[PDB]
Structure formats: C-alpha cells, structure tokens
C-alpha cells in the first residue's frame, strides 16, 4: 500500500510492461470499420505513464 496516483466502434489499444522496478503504460485510440477481429493495419501506441512501484507482477485480471 506504499503507492497511489491519479490523473464496439472504437478500438482502444494498450501495452503494459514492468522493467527494472518501473511499470510502463502506453496507448492508442481509433475508430474501426469491422468489429469481428483486430483491424489489419498500423498505428503505433504512445506512452501514458512510467510508475516507480517496484512490484513483481506475474498475473493480471480485468474489470468492467
């Protein structure tokens, strides 16, 4: 508990990774034409956040 921080037609993309005790997040947003699978094309994700937290992540879960 030693840390806290605050700040189908749409595709939201993200990347999450942990390196050298820093936990990094990236993203991109776009409209899409066909919702049945990820659209074949290219548009790179850009960083949002680079957290100092030092945690050993091995598993994850999602909320809705």
């Amino acid at each position: 508990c030693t840390f806290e921080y605050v700040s189908f037609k749409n595709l939201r993309e993200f990347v999450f990774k942990n390196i050298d005790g820093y936990f990094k997040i990236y993203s991109k947003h776009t409209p899409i034409n066909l919702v049945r699978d990820l659209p074949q094309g290219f548009s790179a994700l850009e960083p949002l956040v680079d957290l100092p937290i030092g945690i050993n992540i091995t598993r994850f879960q999602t909320l809705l």
């Binding site: 030693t2 050298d20 005790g21 820093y22 100092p52 030092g54 945690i55 050993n56």
Partner: peptide, 22 residues
C-alpha cells in the same frame, strides 16, 4: 535498536524470515 531490520533491480517485497539489527 530492534526497529531496524533485514530479510531484481529496484524490486521491493514485504512478504514472509525477517531479523532486526542489534
């Protein structure tokens, strides 16, 4: 003083195994 104690880069782990210094 018993309040100061010991057991990847910049990792932290509070799980338990711990000993104070003397």
């Amino acid at each position: 003083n018993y309040n100061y104690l010991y057991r990847k880069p910049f990792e932290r782990d509070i799980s338990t195994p711990l000993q104070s210094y003397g």
